[PDB]
Write a protein that binds this ligand. Structure first.
Ligand SMILES: [Cl-]
Ligand SMILES: [Cl-]
Ligand SMILES: [Cl-]
Ligand SMILES: [Cl-]
Ligand SMILES: [Cl-]
Ligand SMILES: [Cl-]
Length: 192
């Protein structure tokens, strides 16, 4: 049994973050899920226990995948600002939309709240589309850990049966993310 364990459901965007990053590092790890652990993802590595997504991504990068963890604080800030932005500004907005269209059973849905989250999610993502029009990645010129938090959400953004606004840089960014095998293994899971 490996030293690293990741509790949590594989169809969670937060868990995709930890899984993808773990897959990006190459470490051996265990993924425990319940079918038919004090939080959405729980990362235990030795004595260390975390139940918070962007800190997990940030820890496994610094500890096992330093290419994803830029050494200069000023360079790190370019991508790190997008890690908190995903959590502070986009997640809650996007979580409602996703819950509306995939997880409430029938068309008995708050069609007004769903339509609201879609517009606001598009408005917010449009700001990330503008950043991706200046540099190829959220972390700068190369891919790094700053791309991982929104990258795990953007999978569900583009695969939901919703009417997306035209965000071409954001989509091209998503096209490059899918070339990464760790992304295919960590993020591109069944969109349940
Ligand atoms: Cl989601
Ligand atoms: Cl350790
Ligand atoms: Cl915590
Ligand atoms: Cl940028
Ligand atoms: Cl179109
Ligand atoms: Cl297109």
């Amino acid at each position: 049994m490996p030293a690293i364990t990741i509790w949590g459901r594989r169809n969670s965007s937060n868990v995709r973050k930890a899984l993808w990053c773990a897959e990006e590092a190459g470490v051996a790890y265990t993924s425990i899920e319940v079918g038919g652990n004090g939080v959405v993802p729980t990362l235990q590595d030795g004595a260390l226990v975390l139940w918070e997504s962007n800190a997990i991504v940030r820890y496994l990068a610094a500890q096992y995948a330093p290419a994803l963890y830029p050494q200069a604080p000023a360079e790190r800030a370019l991508g790190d600002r997008w890690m908190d932005w995903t959590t502070s500004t986009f997640a809650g907005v996007f979580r409602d939309l996703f819950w509306g269209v995939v997880r409430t059973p029938e068309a008995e849905r708050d069609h007004a709240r769903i339509a609201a989250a879609l517009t606001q999610s598009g408005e917010l993502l449009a700001r990330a589309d503008a950043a991706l029009a200046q540099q190829p990645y959220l972390s700068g010129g190369r891919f790094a850990m700053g791309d991982i938090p929104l990258g795990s959400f953007i999978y569900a953004w583009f695969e939901m049966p919703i009417e997306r606004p035209e965000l071409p840089h954001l989509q091209a960014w998503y096209a490059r993310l899918r070339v990464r095998p760790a992304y295919q293994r960590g993020v591109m899971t069944a969109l349940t």
